[PDB]
Amino acid sequence: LELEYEEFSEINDQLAAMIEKALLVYQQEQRPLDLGAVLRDYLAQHPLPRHFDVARILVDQAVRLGVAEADFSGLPAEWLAINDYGAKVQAHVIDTY
């Protein structure tokens, strides 16, 4: 028969837009950014099933802003908890912008 069609959802693009707008301030003020605190504060704004995607996208946006000078110290970072049910994150603080 004749060909049917199906459409995509843009929810994740919208999510990226909110996160990038919310995060732009850190660069502009060159404020030190800690992934642990930011993830813990930002996951509280969405329900549990969506946390994983939010974490991924937030990390994608955050890593573009500068580097963490501690990485050259030879000292590994710890696994910080960011919500209940037991999710963890590992990252040094971002200092060099």
Binding site: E69, F72, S73, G74, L75, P76, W79
Partner: protein, 246 residues
Amino acid sequence: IERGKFRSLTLVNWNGFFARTFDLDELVTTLSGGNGAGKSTTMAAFVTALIPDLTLLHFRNTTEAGATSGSRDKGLHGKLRAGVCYSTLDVINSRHQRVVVGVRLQQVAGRDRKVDIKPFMIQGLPTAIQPTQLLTENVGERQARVLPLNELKDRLDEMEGVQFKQFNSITDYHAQMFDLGVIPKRLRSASDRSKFYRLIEASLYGGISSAITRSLRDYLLPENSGVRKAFQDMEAALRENRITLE
């Protein structure tokens, strides 16, 4: 009961990694990043630490996955940096003994792209000390200093109860790894090393391996001595007599 696990992978002074440690998952670990980020480099580190044999080690590109030897370059030299480099694994046995195994890597100077490799093993390390700390000195400069095997031996011997073993041949290294339950088979000879590497690299690139398919019985069936040695002993009297006559 309570199968052993790989706990972590550490890179020092590799191309793009001055000092990095990956904490491996109990079931699945996923590496993710854009093209050229360095994923295949980490797997190269893992396998080279596991099987430090320069005759077998060949990191061909994923495209052209199945071709011949071709070039004389094995693709490893370019992943190192000037100076001294390390690759180490951290393992926990069923006994819950913490053992650290690894190799020291260095670019051999010359026209050609060659590498020098030396295995080693450490036992009894406290749970409070990480590999990156062992292998680097926090000098006043912005960036630490990677310390050679001499400094490392001196630093480790100072510890109480910690043993540092440095191997002269790959066979000894594999023997120790098997005795501690890090690998499923003790690599008697170079042929065994070749088959083990075939297994690993076939898994790495993926697909129905041609070599595994050819020699299926050689891989899946153990060799049984019982059927034979009776007849070697019974045959002995004739063998000696024949040799004497000749």
